[PDB]
Amino acid sequence: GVQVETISPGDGRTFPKRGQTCVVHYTGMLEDGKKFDSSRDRNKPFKFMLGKQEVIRGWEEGVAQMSVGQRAKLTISPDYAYGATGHPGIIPPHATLVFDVELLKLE
Numbered sequence: 885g886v887q888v889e890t891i892s893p894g895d896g897r898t899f900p901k902r903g904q905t906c907v908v909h910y911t912g913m914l915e916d917g918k919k920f921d922s923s924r925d926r927n928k929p930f931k932f933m934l935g936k937q938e939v940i941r942g943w944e945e946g947v948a949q950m951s952v953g954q955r956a957k958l959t960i961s962p963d964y965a966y967g968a969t970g971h972p973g974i975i976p977p978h979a980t981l982v983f984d985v986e987l988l989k990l991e
């Protein structure tokens with residue numbers, strides 16, 4: 885599954901809905917702390933639409949639990965991420981992923 889652990893609270897009332905665009909900042913890490921990517925290093929938020937099937941399943945499920953303004957750590961099991969394939973060259977097979985995600989805005 886995905887485990888959502890809060891870093892900073894959101895407004896507690898504006899949660900993303902299917903068809904909305906979530907504007908997030910993120911840093912993705914492996915369980916040992918190794919960063920594999922971060923939009924914070926590019927200083928440009930990442931956008932995805934909820935329910936469109938264009939991000940990994942632990943994101944659709946985890947970010948839907950977040951209210952605008954919230955910063956949380958999402959621990960995602962491999963079956964909710966890249967499974968046995970992994971992402972060629974970046975994520976190994978069977979990897980648990982840890983994302984530090986801040987939900988900035990809904991568009």
Ligand SMILES: CCC(C)(C)C(=O)C(=O)N1CCC[C@H]1C(=O)OCCCc1cccnc1
Pocket residue numbers: 921930938939940971974
């Ligand atoms: C390593 C690939 C990259 C940079 C997009 C990433 O880190 C990533 O996946 N990321 C980084 C932010 C969002 C997340 C994502 O969109 O998951 C997509 C993976 C599922 C998928 C969909 C279509 C084709 N291949 C894979």
